[PDB]
């Protein structure tokens, strides 16, 4: 069923991570267009899956472009969302819907969630409470906000915290504090 | 202090509601530019108060334009946010920051919140747990989402629920289900 599709998709990415990782760097459009992502795509709401894809494809390019920010967990998490024909938008998505267990569950873009839980202690990925396998690894977070880097902890110098939908009029190169999740304020920078 | 400013601003709107209500309908730009809203504006983050204002001014015009949707509570709640020079944006704000009690507290755009609590049973407004006075009243919600009307309860006909940041590519006149708050899905329509 839908839960199996989600677990199986992440299991497949892990099993083939050697090849997938290279393709993500060298020919990502070919990777995104692989048939193996179609079952996952069936779980993503039709009204939004193209915008999710444009978002994730842009995040991935940020990661390619900003040295030292490669994050295996983040690539694996987001990769199936890149598989729709992309459309651009100005929105920041904090989570991404998948239809599973008879409801829309939401995968958090930053860090762990009940759907996608990578255990830094055991090194295994758990999807909806089930094992998906072991991740084989290769401060700035380049694949969370479109057009921004998360650069560290809160700095009071930069004023009141903004929500992720309050960033559109910041200047290129401007730093701001952002409420990125419950009780977690981070410093971001709008990319030049 | 800042808490007093918030309570006093809402008390003032209520005390002068007779005049304010007429001006809101007949000469809203004059109303928005009144000096009495400056102390409230000092509480709104400088980086976002113009965008909050463009949002609220647009919501108010929706209410003027859609017959039978006048909502005294909603006008009073949002009015001080209209007092900044407005700037337009495509964002949907679910809550609006005010700096009070040494933190950024958030006034929910739809319905009640700890900061702004209108009691439908007693008919009084409570701001940060203190009385602000009695509201004197004059299904569609026209002043919550920019470019949309909330039109009723969830209708499964219209598919998976979308978050408020997932609405930008809906067509004019299209209906969708929206997760407007925790465990509350509503049907919306994108205005023609």
Numbering used by the authors:
A (entry chain A), B (entry chain A): 541 to 678, 685 to 738
Quoted passage from the original study:
Point mutations in the polymerase basic protein 2 (PB2) of the heterotrimeric viral polymerase and their structural consequences have been linked to host-species specificity and virulence factors in humans. Specific C-terminal domain mutations in the PB2 component of the viral polymerase heterotrimer have been associated with different levels of human virulence, giving structural characterization of this protein a potentially important role in the prevention of future influenza pandemics. In this communication, we introduce the Protein Maker and describe its use in purifying five C-terminal domain subunits of the polymerase basic protein 2 (PB2) from two different subtypes of influenza virus.
Initial success with H5N1 and H1N1 CPB2 proteins informed the design and cloning of genes arising from two other influenza subtypes: H3N2, which was responsible for the 1968 and 1969 Hong Kong flu epidemics, and H7N7, a subtype with wide zoonotic transmissibility and potential for high pathogenicity. Three of the five purified CPB2 proteins yielded crystals (not shown) and a 1.3 Å resolution structure was generated from one of them by X-ray diffraction. Although previous purifications of CPB2 from H5N1 and H1N1 yielded crystals for 204-residue and 222-residue variants, the only protein which provided well diffracting crystals in this effort was a construct consisting of 216 amino acids. Despite the high sequence identity (>95%) across all constructs, including three previously crystallized CPB2 proteins, only one (InvaB.07055.c.D17) of the five tested led to rapid growth of crystals that diffracted to sufficiently high resolution for structure solution and refinement. In such a scenario, construct design may have been limited to residue lengths which previously worked for CBP2 from H1N1 and H5N1, constructs which to date have not generated crystals for H3N2. Thus, we eliminated the 80% chance of failure (or the fivefold increase in bench time) associated with serial processing of five targets for one successful outcome via parallel purification on the Protein Maker.
